[PDB]
Design a protein around this ligand. Structure first.
Ligand SMILES: CCCCCCCCCCCCCCCCCC(=O)OC[C@H](COP(=O)(O)OCCN)OC(=O)CCCCCCCCCCCCCCCCC
Ligand SMILES: CCCCCCCCCCCCCCCCCC(=O)OC[C@H](COP(=O)(O)OCCN)OC(=O)CCCCCCCCCCCCCCCCC
Ligand SMILES: CCCCCCCCCCCCCCCCCC(=O)OC[C@H](COP(=O)(O)OCCN)OC(=O)CCCCCCCCCCCCCCCCC
Ligand SMILES: NC(=O)C1=CN([C@@H]2O[C@H](COP(=O)(O)OP(=O)(O)OC[C@H]3O[C@@H](n4cnc5c(N)ncnc54)[C@H](OP(=O)(O)O)[C@@H]3O)[C@@H](O)[C@H]2O)C=CC1
Ligand code: SF4
Ligand code: SF4
Ligand SMILES: [Zn+2]
Lengths: 118, 134, 49, 242, 154, 185, 122, 353, 425
């Protein structure tokens, strides 16, 4: 029921679904109920998965890093992240990337990373 | 309920054209200082010598004025939920590239009305029949 | 004077969440001494016998 | 605005600082032990005065419960109404509780008030699907609607009740909704049908089924057995050593 | 006629397309049993459906045994009408008015007595019990006269 | 009726007074009757109110007061980076007194714990704030908005798209309301 | 009587002879009222069709051999009778009692095994 | 009759039979559902959990249709019969399309040919473009393209157009229908005077509108009704006079018809239709229609084929006209001697009040 | 040996009829003749479609000309199955169900359920919570009496006081919205205390409203108390004697109007009512006029209590300090392991309540409100039964109205403080 890009794109900043059980917008907004409708007027929030991966890697020398979202009481419960593996460590609440400085040369060697590194 | 001295004074401060226009939408003779303008073009005013809860008011940009036309942060200000107008509100300055750029009014009774739908895939998948050849 | 300032402009840092020191101490409050829920009275039942 | 001369800004008065707040730990059950003996004595005296019908009594905090057989409902409530030391002349509430594990599944609960003595009492009897209870409408006019509610929600008959009919459910409603075996959304539902030009009853069909999170109940008991608070005047003596 | 389904039972207003055909409806003449299902107001369907009477097993994910203490009475899910996907929201619709109902009993004779009285068909699942075996910490360190056969790691 | 013990002092009323014993003169008695003095006094009260300021505000040009705690239209919020705050704990779905929330979740493509379905049936919701109280990350909140009456009931079945768009539009209010009341939460 | 029009005080039956009189008395009042019931709720059926339903309702409980259960059924009959003869019921309530006026029919269960199986459990 | 329906084009419909929340699987468009008969087909589909597309012209007119279905089941579409985009936006998702669009009088905007012939032709062409499975076209009794009567004539060509564009068209020929909100029973029972230029001598076999609506539903379920034609009529023939006898027999009022002669009434009927802005029940082609007599085609499927037995109109007059019989105390027949005697057991005035 | 003993009907159970004693006759004070002619009564339905005094009320009256013969209220038009739903909720989840019973007296409704659950929890709530709940209790009593007295006045024709007093309602509804985020259904009083503390400028704003509320009461009394039309509409109407009021289950003003000095706040003190001073208005003639005067004086005693609560408000926590019952502060929940677990469990499982049962009553604005809760030891209540004063009062409508004029029925419907969410639940 949708020709325009608002009716096909999963989000303005991402064409594709980001979970296996996610219904593609093209099939979700199809059928009789979407016939005489403005599609740009429909709610289409930006995909959070694309936005969090623009966040640069917060480098640290310490092995363990605390993350609470940065709002103090306005964030998430404080958790502690281990950066000892040679990879980008990510907060399981807010998705923020963290990496140890010991792994900077190997991470810079990597062809493509999950996070910009800069 | 304006009273003579109030209405006569506001008339002098605003002029008869403005007076009659104000009488065409709000039905009162109000005058105050311009606090600011929102994204949709609504103008917001304050006067602390008015009656309680009448010290803040909006002049709507659109003839068919609707209460949902008010920009979010201004909605808090006019409803006395905050005292700092959005013109001085730091939380209005955080850059959110995902934030809606044009104002979002209520879209009911139009063809932009929100249509709900299932956001998930079917729970069960049937076999795709493959007749084996003889 | 009335609702001035608006409650939405009350400075958040001023208000302090209070803690009573027996219940909220870090030193001398074992939970079992103030566990009045688990010390609930059983009903006292008397039959004809 | 024109302010009142003697009404200054009440927010502008500074408040004295508050420091280390200290609140003692209170067991709220302790304050009732002062009357624990008296409540047992009153229950015991009632049992002695009406031994033919009073099976047991219980005292929890300041609440005295009296447990009776259904046949004694009229004699027991007559005594609680008219006795000079029991002037429970108001029925606060009559209701029922369902216990399917019991043969007499219905527990009938009466709460009484004595304004003269500033006291309350609870009387419990039991009933079944086919075993009625005496109506107390001849002793208390207020009891009339409470018994209709028990009959409506639980299906309990009150013999001697005038005009025992439904009070809460729709006319022609089938079932007693406060039974544990009666399901939450019931059996049927209504709608307006445009062919019949009237409302029609149909089998119940929910667009979203009720989700029962009862299975999230803690796998560990969280309350424990509690504390015994029987007074000494109602505990048996013990043999001395040697 | 020896568990034959009575295709001529009278219906009531709650009889739907998902109601099973009963075998035995109460008439008030059963010996020694109160016919609650005849007077309860409950639909004919509950005398056509089977309940399960069992002690819930301890979850494999926890050691607490609180929910294994009591006897549970539960209705079996039918072939049709228990759940389906609502086309609008994807919610899960039901035609089974007993789906979210369970009863708790102190003993299974109580559960059986209630089920016989209402006229439910029932099936009693007895609880599997643990087989006792004494355990000793010192068995972690028994002397092995022969090849070790297993290397323990505390 | 009276409490046990001796009758309260002076509980018994004195005997009724006859017409003869009334301590009020005939002229006053006749005058009030024929002149309707207390009715005239009540009318005079209305004139006093006739010249007092009215309490009326001119809605929708003016609005009544609301607090940072006000419970209105639901919204889903983000972090400053734009990542969803919601991690599919299901605390709001469990506490909901009306069963208005339905949630489904799996691992996202990046392995993050996120929702795939987040619906709120606004025709089931009792606007109690329990979800907002139960949320450990401030993901579900009630906005101050109350002016969203709809033409059809289907427009009140909010899915995740509708709720995340609401959070994007209302975020500066949502942060201001959280900023003012978080010390008390 | 005294509380409202058709109010019957709840009493137990003394014996089976007492119970039978009440059951016949209850049936007699029901089938007598059938002409009034038709015109009072504008039922689109003849009094013959209504009176048959009365007998079947009494025949579902013909085999009851327990006195306490009879007292329960008698109390239900009086309650239904009062709320019918008083215009407390609405046409929707009485019409729902006639199983023919459901848009899926009156034979709401499968005739035999194979019709229910071919349609999908009825 | 089962959990599986396979449509003309093969779609399997796994259906959960039930009520409002159930899954009927069919998507239907019903043109002209805002009239007398459209409420019985829309109601039957929606309450089985089928999706019904309702194209409408006046918003306030279609408001009652939404109550039939669950949320998301009754869908409204703004439409004009001369807006092709609107017709085929209402049809491209449907597996069955009902055409109930008709009008007994011409209007300033629509001739009988414009609404029937051109109306069907745009709809039927939309049906074939999107390969709708079943296109049920509703028509009239006496539908014949060689008739002088434009009503019957324009119902004739539209049959031929529909069957040409879409050979599997199912044509339904209902006789004048009675029932709730009909124009037979209430028209006789309500208007003080009728201008009938034939002494109410036209005969026909009235059929309940409920049964026509039920029949329309039954054709959806059997694929054997495609390419067929259905004359749908009641058991016994009546005439407008004999039915008026029943009406008068039930409301205790005497019918009065002026009965102006045909050469004078017919031009007047034209004038009234061109100056009054509503259905006056009177027009030129309607005066001509009253001389015609319903002739039933013998080579057309009946209710028999659908497993139905129409009821006679005299069974329904009392039900549908009961709220129109006076019930004032002034109008009861005289008191019996039994009644005269019992009055003397009561005081008939309160003397203390 | 029941109920098989009833299978063949032995030993009928004794009724109240089997205990009717003949009165002592010594001291017991109690042809076509037109006197034998019967009088036919006409039975009129009032409501809910045809306008009534207020609410979902189908009142079926048998009349003799202008006089009431039998009064038969049909209720259940607002029966929503609240008591059954509470068995599928946690104690937290059942609390909002109490806002919607007497839905102009929300905080005292939730107060009675909190006190009953606190009693089975065996916890003593902090002193500040006690004073906040008592303070909001009397604010809610004024809100209720403003609705009750003035809408009762509007029913008998007095339009103006209803307009004046509902601006007072608007001012006090702001206090409800400032503490919670709701005008009506605050869900503010919970077992353990109150949801959150009051904002730091509320007490002074309540105080400012308090300095002007006495004048609002007085101006209401200027239109009604001495008005001869008001007196002639209320005096001698809806009389119930002190003895019958007790036997009919009448509580609150319906009981105190008949001369019985009884207030639950005095007889069984709860929260902070033992720490405050107030008087109990009591009538002597048991009529609508006495009950109107008691309610007007209750306005002044409520304001008198509120002023004492403003000055006696202590510092400290507003929620019982055990995170096994009350939710931890959000900063604690995001900071330490123990608090986060207790937050998770309280919002998914709920707190477990020790097994037992209790009947707990308060002096609600409409009279004695009680709740009977049975706990099975789990996190869901086994049984919640609500004792609504309006249920007992409306059950007495026939007793107080039989033999009286149809033109007085609106007076006694209004003299009972009747909200049908209370009556039907
Ligand atoms: C209708 C229009 C209104 C007519 C009434 C208004 C005029 C009222 C005149 C005052 C009435 C009483 C006059 C009087 O003399 O009262 C004295 C006597 C009892 O004396 P008392 O006041 O009770 O002693 C003090 C105790 N505290 O009381 C008595 O013994 C009664 C004496 C009555 C004499 C009345 C003479 C005046 C009649 C005025 C007619 C007006 C005509 C024009 C209109
Ligand atoms: C324009 C200029 C101003 C106009 C002023 C209008 C004032 C408002 C008029 C509103 C309508 C009048 C209201 C009257 C109220 C009423 O009817 O009260 C009835 C009252 C009952 O008194 P009664 O039956 O005699 O027995 C008394 C013992 N309890 O009986 C009475 O109270 C009667 C007393 C009033 C008599 C007034 C007529 C006499 C006028 C002076 C001579
Ligand atoms: C202020 C003055 C405003 C004047 C506005 C004039 C608008 C009327 C235009 C009349 C017209 O063009 O149509 C002719 C109309 C016939 O109505 P029609 O819709 O063709 O028939 C339907 C059922 N007979 O005929 C009419 O309805 C005319 C009714 C009188 C005007
Ligand atoms: N009723 C009878 O006894 C008989 C009827 N028929 C046929 O039966 C079918 C249904 O009959 P019935 O329901 O009683 O008829 P109605 O007159 O009650 O309804 C006819 C429908 O056609 C629609 N319609 C008419 N003209 C137009 C137009 N120009 N453009 C768009 N829509 C239009 C109307 O919509 P709107 O409401 O907006 O005008 C209405 O929904 C019709 O095809 C009719 O000709 C034939 C023989 C007998
Ligand atoms: S909104 Fe909050 S409470 Fe609900 S699932 Fe998301 S994170 Fe958990
Ligand atoms: S506000 Fe209350 S009812 Fe509404 S979704 Fe949140 S928890 Fe559920
Ligand atoms: Zn983080």
């Amino acid at each position: 029921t949708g020709r325009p890009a608002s009716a096909v794109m999963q989000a303005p900043n991402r064409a594709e679904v980001w979970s296996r059980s996610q219904r593609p917008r093209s099939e979700a907004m199809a059928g009789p109920r979407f016939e005489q409708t403005d599609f740009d007027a429909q709610p289409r929030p930006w995909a959070a998965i694309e936005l969090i991966h623009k966040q640069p890697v917060r480098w640290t020398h310490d092995r363990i890093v605390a993350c609470d979202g940065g709002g103090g009481p306005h964030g998430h419960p404080k958790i502690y992240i281990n950066t000892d593996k040679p990879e980008i460590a990510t907060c399981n609440y807010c998705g923020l990337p963290f990496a140890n400085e010991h792994h900077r040369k190997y991470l810079e060697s990597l062809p493509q990373t999950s996070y910009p590194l800069n | 309920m304006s009273y003579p001295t109030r209405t006569l004074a506001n008339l002098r401060k605003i002029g008869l054209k403005e007076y009659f226009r104000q009488l065409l939408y709000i039905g009162d003779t109000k005058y105050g200082e311009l606090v600011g303008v929102d994204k949709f073009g609504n103008k917001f005013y304050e006067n602390k010598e008015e009656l309680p809860l009448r010290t803040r008011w909006v002049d709507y940009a659109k003839h068919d004025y609707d209460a949902a036309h008010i920009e979010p942060m201004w909605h808090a200000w006019i409803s006395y939920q905050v005292d700092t107008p959005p013109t001085r509100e730091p939380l209005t300055q955080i850059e959110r590239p995902w934030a809606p750029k044009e104002h979002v009014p209520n879209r009911s009774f139009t063809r932009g009305a929100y249509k709900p739908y299932n956001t998930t895939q079917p729970k069960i998948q049937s076999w795709e029949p493959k007749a084996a050849p003889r | 004077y009335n609702r001035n300032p608006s409650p939405g402009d009350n400075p958040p840092l001023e208000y302090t969440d209070p803690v009573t020191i027996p219940a909220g101490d870090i030193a001398d409050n074992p939970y079992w001494k103030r566990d009045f829920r688990r010390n609930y009275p059983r009903p006292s039942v008397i039959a004809q016998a | 605005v024109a302010l009142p001369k003697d009404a200054p800004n009440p927010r502008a008065i500074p408040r004295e600082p508050v420091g280390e707040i200290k609140q003692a730990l209170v067991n709220p059950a302790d304050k009732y032990q002062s009357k624990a003996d008296n409540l047992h004595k009153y229950g015991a005296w009632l049992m002695s005065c009406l031994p033919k019908y009073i099976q047991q009594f219980s005292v929890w905090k300041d609440e005295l419960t009296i447990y009776i057989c259904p046949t004694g409902v009229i004699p027991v409530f007559s005594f609680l109404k008219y006795n000079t030391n029991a002037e429970f002349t108001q029925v606060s509430d009559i209701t029922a509780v369902d216990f399917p594990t019991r043969e007499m599944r219905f527990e009938i609960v009466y709460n009484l008030l004595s304004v003269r003595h500033n006291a309350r009492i609870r009387v419990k009897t039991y009933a079944d699907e086919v075993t009625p209870v005496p109506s107390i409408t001849s002793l208390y006019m207020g009891a009339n609607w409470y018994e209709r509610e028990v009959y409506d929600m639980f299906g309990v008959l009150f013999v001697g009740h005038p005009d025992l009919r439904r009070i809460m459910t729709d006319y022609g409603f089938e079932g007693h909704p406060l039974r544990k075996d009666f399901p939450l959304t019931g059996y049927t539902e209504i709608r307006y049908d445009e062919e019949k030009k009237r409302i029609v009853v149909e089998p119940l069909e929910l667009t979203q089924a009720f989700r029962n999170f009862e299975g999230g109940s803690s796998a560990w008991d969280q309350v424990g057995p509690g504390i015994d608070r029987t007074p000494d005047t109602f505990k048996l003596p013990t043999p001395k050593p040697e | 006629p020896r568990n034959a389904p009575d295709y001529n039972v009278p219906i009531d207003i709650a009889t739907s397309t998902f109601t099973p055909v009963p075998k035995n409806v109460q008439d008030g003449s059963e010996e020694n049993v109160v016919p609650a299902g005849l007077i309860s107001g409950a639909p004919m369907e509950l005398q056509a459906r089977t309940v399960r009477i069992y002690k819930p097993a301890k979850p494999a994910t926890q050691s607490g045994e609180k929910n294994t203490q009591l006897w549970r009475m539960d209705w079996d899910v039918l072939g049709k009408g228990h759940r389906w996907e609502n086309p609008l929201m994807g919610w899960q619709s039901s035609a089974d008015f007993m789906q979210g109902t369970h009863l708790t009993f102190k003993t299974k004779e109580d559960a059986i007595a209630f089920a016989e009285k209402q006229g439910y068909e029932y099936f009693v699942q007895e609880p599997n019990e643990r087989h006792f075996r004494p355990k000793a910490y010192a068995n972690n360190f028994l002397y092995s006269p022969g090849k070790l056969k297993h290397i323990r790691t505390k | 009726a009276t409490p046990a013990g001796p009758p309260p002092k002076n509980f018994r009323l004195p005997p009724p007074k006859n017409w003869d014993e009334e301590s009020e003169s005939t002229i006053d008695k006749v005058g009030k009757y024929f002149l309707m003095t207390e009715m005239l006094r009540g009318m005079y009260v209305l004139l006093e109110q006739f010249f007092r300021p009215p309490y009326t505000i001119y809605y929708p040009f003016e609005k009544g007061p609301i607090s940072p705690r006000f419970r209105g239209e639901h919204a889903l919020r983000r972090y400053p980076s734009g990542e969803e705050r919601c991690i599919a704990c299901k605390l709001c779905e469990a506490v909901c007194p009306a069963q208005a929330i339905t949630i489904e979740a799996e691992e996202r493509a990046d392995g993050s714990r996120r929702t795939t379905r987040y619906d709120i049936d606004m025709t089931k919701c009792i606007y109690c704030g329990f979800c907002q109280e139960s949320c450990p990350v401030d993901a579900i909140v009630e906005s101050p908005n109350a002016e969203y009456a709809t033409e059809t009931r289907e427009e009140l079945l909010y899915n995740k798209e509708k709720l995340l768009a609401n959070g994007d539009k209302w975020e500066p209010e949502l942060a201001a309301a959280i900023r003012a009341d978080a010390p008390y939460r | 009587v005294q509380p409202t029009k058709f109010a019957v005080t709840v009493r137990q039956s003394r014996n089976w002879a007492d119970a039978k009189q009440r059951v016949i008395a209850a049936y007699r009042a029901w089938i007598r009222a059938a002409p009034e019931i038709q015109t009072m709720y504008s039922i689109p059926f003849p009094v013959s069709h209504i009176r048959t339903r009365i007998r079947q309702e009494f025949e579902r409980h013909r085999y009851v051999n327990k006195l306490n259960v009879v007292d329960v059924l008698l109390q239900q009959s009086n309650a239904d009778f009062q709320e019918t003869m008083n215009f407390w019921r609405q046409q929707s309530h009485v019409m729902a009692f006639f199983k023919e006026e459901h848009f899926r029919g009156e034979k709401r269960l499968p005739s035999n095994f194979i019709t229910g199986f071919l349609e999908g459990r009825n | 009759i089962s959990d599986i329906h396979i449509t003309r084009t093969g779609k399997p419909l796994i259906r959960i039979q039930g009520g409002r929340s159930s899954l009927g699987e069919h998507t239907a468009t019903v043109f002209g559902a805002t009239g007398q008969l459209g409420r019985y087909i829309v109601n039957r589909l929606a309450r089985q959990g089928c999706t019904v597309i309702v194209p409408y012209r006046e918003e306030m007119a279609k408001r009652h249709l939404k109550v039939s279905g669950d949320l998301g089941r009754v869908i409204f579409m703004e439409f004009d019969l001369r807006n092709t985009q609107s017709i085929e936006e209402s049809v491209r998702h449907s597996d069955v399309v009902y055409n109930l669009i008709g009008r007994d009088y011409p209007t300033k905007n629509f001739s009988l040919a414009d609404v029937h012939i051109e109306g069907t032709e745009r709809i039927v062409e939309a049906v074939a473009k999107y390969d709708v499975d079943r296109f049920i076209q509703v028509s009239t009794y006496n539908a014949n393209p060689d008739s002088t009567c434009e009503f019957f004539r324009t119902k004739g060509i539209a049959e031929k157009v529909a069957r040409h564009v879409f050979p599997e068209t199912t044509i339904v020929r209902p006789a004048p229908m009675f029932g709730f909100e009909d124009r037979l029973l209430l028209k006789l029972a309500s208007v003080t005077n009728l201008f009938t230029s034939n002494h109410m001598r036209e005969k026909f076999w009235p059929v309940h509108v409920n049964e026509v609506g039920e029949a329309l539903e039954r054709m959806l379920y059997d694929d054997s009704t495609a390419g067929q034609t259905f004359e749908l009529y009641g058991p016994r023939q009546y005439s407008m006079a004999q039915i008026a006898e029943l009406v008068d027999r039930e409301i205790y009022k005497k019918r009065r018809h002026i009965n102006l002669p045909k050469p004078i009434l017919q031009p007047l009927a034209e004038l009234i239709n061109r100056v009054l802005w509503w259905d006056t029940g009177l027009s030129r082609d309607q005066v001509e229609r009253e001389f015609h007599d319903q002739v039933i085609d013998p080579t057309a499927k009946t209710f028999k084929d659908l497993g139905m037995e129409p009821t006679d109109i005299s069974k329904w007059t009392y039900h549908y006209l009961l709220p129109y019989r006076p019930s004032t105390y002034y109008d009861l027949p005289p008191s019996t001697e039994k009644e005269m005697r019992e009055e003397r057991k009561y005081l008939h005035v309160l003397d203390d009040q | 040996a029941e109920p098989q003993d009833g299978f063949q009907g032995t030993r009928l159970i004794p009724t109240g009829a089997d205990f009717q004693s003949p009165p002592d006759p010594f001291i017991d004070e109690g042809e076509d003749s037109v006197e034998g002619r019967k009088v036919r009564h006409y039975t009129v339905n009032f409501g809910p479609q045809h306008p009534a005094a207020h609410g979902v009320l189908r009142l079926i009256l048998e009349l003799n000309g202008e006089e009431i013969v039998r009064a038969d209220p049909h209720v259940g038009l607002l029966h929503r199955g609240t008591e059954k739903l509470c068995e599928y909720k946690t104690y937290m989840q059942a609390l909002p169900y109490f806002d919607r019973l007497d839905y102009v007296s929300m905080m005292t409704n939730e107060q009675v359920f909190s006190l009953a659950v606190e009693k089975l929890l065996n916890i003593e709530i902090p002193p500040r919570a006690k004073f906040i709940r008592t303070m909001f209790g009397e604010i809610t009593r004024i809100l209720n009496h403003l609705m009750s007295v003035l809408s009762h006045a509007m029913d008998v024709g007095a339009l103006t006081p209803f307009l004046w007093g509902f601006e007072e309602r608007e001012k006090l509804m702001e206090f409800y919205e400032r503490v919670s985020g709701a005008r009506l259904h605050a869900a503010y009083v919970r077992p353990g205390g109150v949801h959150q503390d009051i904002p730091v400028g509320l007490l002074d704003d309540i105080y400012q409203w308090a300095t002007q509320f006495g004048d609002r009461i007085d101006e209401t009394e200027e239109m009604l108390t001495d008005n001869r039309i008001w007196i002639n509409r209320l005096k001698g109407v809806g009389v119930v004697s002190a003895a019958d009021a007790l036997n009919l289950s009448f509580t609150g003003v319906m009981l105190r109007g008949s001369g019985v000095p009884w207030d639950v706040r005095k007889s069984s003190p709860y929260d902070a009512y033992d720490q405050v001073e107030f008087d109990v208005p009591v009538g002597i003639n048991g009529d609508c006029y006495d009950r109107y005067l008691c309610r007007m004086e209750e306005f002044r005693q409520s304001l008198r209590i509120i002023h004492q609560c403003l000055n006696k408000m202590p510092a400290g926590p507003v929620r019982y300090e055990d995170y096994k019952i009350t939710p931890p502060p959000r900063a604690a929940m995001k900071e330490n392991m123990e608090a986060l677990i207790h937050h998770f469990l309280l919002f998914t499982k709920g707190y477990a309540v020790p097994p037992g049962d209790t009947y707990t009553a308060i002096e609600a604005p409409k009279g004695e409100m009680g709740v009977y809760v049975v706990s099975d030891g789990s996190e869901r209540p086994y049984r919640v039964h609500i004792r609504a004063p309006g249920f007992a009062h409306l059950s007495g409508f026939d007793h107080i109205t039989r033999g009286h004029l149809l033109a007085d029925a609106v007076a006694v419907i209004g003299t009972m403080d009747l909200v049908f969410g209370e009556v039907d639940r």
